[PDB]
Amino acid sequence: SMQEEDTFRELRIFLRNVTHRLAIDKRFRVFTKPVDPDEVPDYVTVIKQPMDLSSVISKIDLHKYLTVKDYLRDIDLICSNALEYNPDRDPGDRLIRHRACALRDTAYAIIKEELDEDFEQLCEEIQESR
Numbered sequence: 001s002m003q004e005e006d007t008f009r010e011l012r013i014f015l016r017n018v019t020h021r022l023a024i025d026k027r028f029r030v031f032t033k034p035v036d037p038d039e040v041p042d043y044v045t046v047i048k049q050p051m052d053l054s055s056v057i058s059k060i061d062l063h064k065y066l067t068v069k070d071y072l073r074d075i076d077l078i079c080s081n082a083l084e085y086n087p088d089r090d091p092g093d094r095l096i097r098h099r100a101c102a103l104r105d106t107a108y109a110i111i112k113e114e115l116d117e118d119f120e121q122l123c124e125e126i127q128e129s130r
């Protein structure tokens with residue numbers, strides 16, 4: 001229905017604003033663009049499902065997220081990819097892990113404070129109806 005399309009549009013506007021807020025944070029700059037294979041030719045080898053905030057915007061705009069849970073799965077990938085690719089005790093790896101945990105925690109904290117639980121529940125029910 002048109003009302004269901006309006007609901008999904010509101011979801012995309014919300015997710016684009018959350019993603020923009022993460023992308024303008026200087027801590028998260030490394031997560032804004034895909035990994036350049038020139039710099040890291042082993043990246044695409046080790047990390048099966050690369051994810052970054054530019055890819056998330058592209059997915060919102062392709063109507064790939066029908067619930068906030070589906071969006072948080074891609075935020076969780078950004079975090080888990082960084083924990084897996086940079087697991088060493090050296091400061092460069094620890095800094096990337098801490099920034100990735102902080103992205104993830106920030107996204108969840110914005111959604112806890114600003115997502116209406118009944119809005120998420122409605123999206124879930126439309127999705128499950130398709």
Ligand SMILES: OCCn1cc(Br)cn1
Binds near residue numbers: 079
């Ligand atoms: O540092 C542990 C927190 N964490 C986030 C993901 Br995604 C998996 N674990």
Ligand SMILES: OCCn1cc(Br)cn1
Binds near residue numbers: 094095097098101
């Ligand atoms: O392991 C993810 C969380 N973390 C904290 C520091 Br400090 C570095 N990583």
Ligand SMILES: [Cl-]
């Ligand atoms: Cl830096």
